[PDB]
Amino acid sequence: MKRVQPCSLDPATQKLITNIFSKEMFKNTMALMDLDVKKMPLGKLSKQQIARGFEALEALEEALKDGGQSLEELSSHFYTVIPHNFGHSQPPPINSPELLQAKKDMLLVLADIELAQALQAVSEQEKTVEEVPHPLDRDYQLLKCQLQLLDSGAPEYKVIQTYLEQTGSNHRCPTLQHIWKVNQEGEEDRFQAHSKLGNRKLLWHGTNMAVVAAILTSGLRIMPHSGGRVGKGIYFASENSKSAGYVIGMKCGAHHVGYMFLGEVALGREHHINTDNPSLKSPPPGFDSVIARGHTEPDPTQDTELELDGQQVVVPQGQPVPCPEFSSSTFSQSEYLIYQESQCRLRYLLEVH
Ligand SMILES: O=C(CCc1nc2ccccc2c(=O)[nH]1)N[C@H](CO)Cc1ccccc1
Q: Are strands 320-322 and 294-298 parallel, antiparallel or unpaired?
A: antiparallel
Q: What is the CA radius of gyration of the chain?
A: 21
Q: What are phi and psi of 111, to 5 degrees?
A: -65, -35
Experimental technique for the deposited model: X-ray
Handedness of CA 160, 161, 166, 168 (dihedral sign): positive
Buried b (16+ CB within 10 A) or exposed e, 69-92: eebeebbbbbbebbebbeeeeebe
**Rounded to an integer, what distance in angstroms lies between the CA atom of residue 166 and that of residue 316?**
9
**Rounded to an integer, what distance in angstroms lies between the CA atom of residue 288 and that of residue 342?**
12
Q: Which of 246, 332, 334, 350 is the pocket-test mutation for ligand 1 (most atoms within 8 Å of CB)?
A: 246
Contact 27, 37 (CB under 8 A): yes
205 Cβ closer than 6 Å to some ligand 1 atom: yes
**Rounded to an integer, what distance in angstroms lies between the CA atom of residue 100 and that of residue 103?**
5
Q: Which residues, 6+ apart, have CB-to-CB distance to 57 below 8 Å?
A: 78, 94, 100, 103, 104, 107, 225
Contact 312, 305 (CB under 8 A): yes
Q: Which of 29, 204, 207 is the pocket-test mutation for ligand 1 (most atoms within 8 Å of CB)?
A: 207
- Kindly give the number of the ligand 1 atom that is closest to the alpha carbon of 260: 14
Beta-carbon count within 10 A of 211 CB? 22
Beta-carbon count within 10 A of 195 CB? 11
**Rounded to an integer, what distance in angstroms lies between the CA atom of residue 271 and that of residue 285?**
10
Residue 147 Cα to ligand 1 midpoint, Å, equals 22
What's the one-letter identity of residue 142?
A: L
Buried b (16+ CB within 10 A) or exposed e, 163-186: bbebbbeeeebbebebbbbbebee
- Kindly give the number of the ligand 1 atom that is closest to the alpha carbon of 215: 19
Question: Of the residues 114, 264, 335, 351, which is catalytic?
Answer: 335
Q: Which residues, 6+ apart, have CB-to-CB distance to 108 below 8 Å?
A: 223, 225, 226
Spacing of C-alpha 207 from chain mean position:
4
237 Cβ closer than 6 Å to some ligand 1 atom: yes
Contact 302, 349 (CB under 8 A): no
Residue 184 Cα to ligand 1 midpoint, Å, equals 20
335 Cβ closer than 6 Å to some ligand 1 atom: yes
Handedness of CA 74, 80, 81, 82 (dihedral sign): positive
Give the sheet arrangement for strand 335-338, strand by strand: 234-236, 335-338, 289-292, 270-273
Q: Nearest C-alpha to atom 8 of ligand 1 is from which residue?
A: 235
Q: What are phi and psi of 182, to 5 degrees?
A: -120, 120
Q: Nearest C-alpha to atom 26 of ligand 1 is from which residue?
A: 105
Segment holding 337, helix H or strand E: strand 335-338
**Rounded to an integer, what distance in angstroms lies between the CA atom of residue 277 and that of residue 229?**
6
Query: Read out DSSP for 175-231?
Result: PEEEEEEEE-TTSHHHHHTTTT---EEEEEEE--GGGHHHHHHH-S---TT--STT-
Residue 59 Cα to ligand 1 midpoint, Å, equals 24
Q: Nearest C-alpha to atom 20 of ligand 1 is from which residue?
A: 105
Q: Are strands 3-4 and 131-132 parallel, antiparallel or unpaired?
A: parallel
Domains in the chain: ranges and CATH: 1-143 (1.20.142.10), 144-353 (3.90.228.10)
Among residues 351, 348, 160, 320, the alpha carbon closest in space to that of 264 is found at 348
Q: Which residues, 6+ apart, have CB-to-CB distance to 8 below 8 Å?
A: 134, 137
The total number of residues shown for the chain amounts to 353
**Rounded to an integer, what distance in angstroms lies between the CA atom of residue 125 and that of residue 296?**
54
How far CA 269 is from CA of 19, 98, 133, 266, 302, in Å, comes to 38, 31, 47, 9, 21
Resolution number, Å: 2.1
351 Cβ closer than 6 Å to some ligand 1 atom: no
Beta-carbon count within 10 A of 248 CB? 16
Q: Nearest C-alpha to atom 22 of ligand 1 is from which residue?
A: 105
105 Cβ closer than 6 Å to some ligand 1 atom: yes
Q: Nearest C-alpha to atom 3 of ligand 1 is from which residue?
A: 207
Is 335 annotated as catalytic? yes
Instruction: Give CA angle at 208 (109, 170), nearest 5°.
Output: 145
Residue 255 Cα to ligand 1 midpoint, Å, equals 23
Q: Which residues, 6+ apart, have CB-to-CB distance to 308 below 8 Å?
A: 264, 347
Contact 214, 112 (CB under 8 A): yes
**Rounded to an integer, what distance in angstroms lies between the CA atom of residue 69 and that of residue 141?**
47
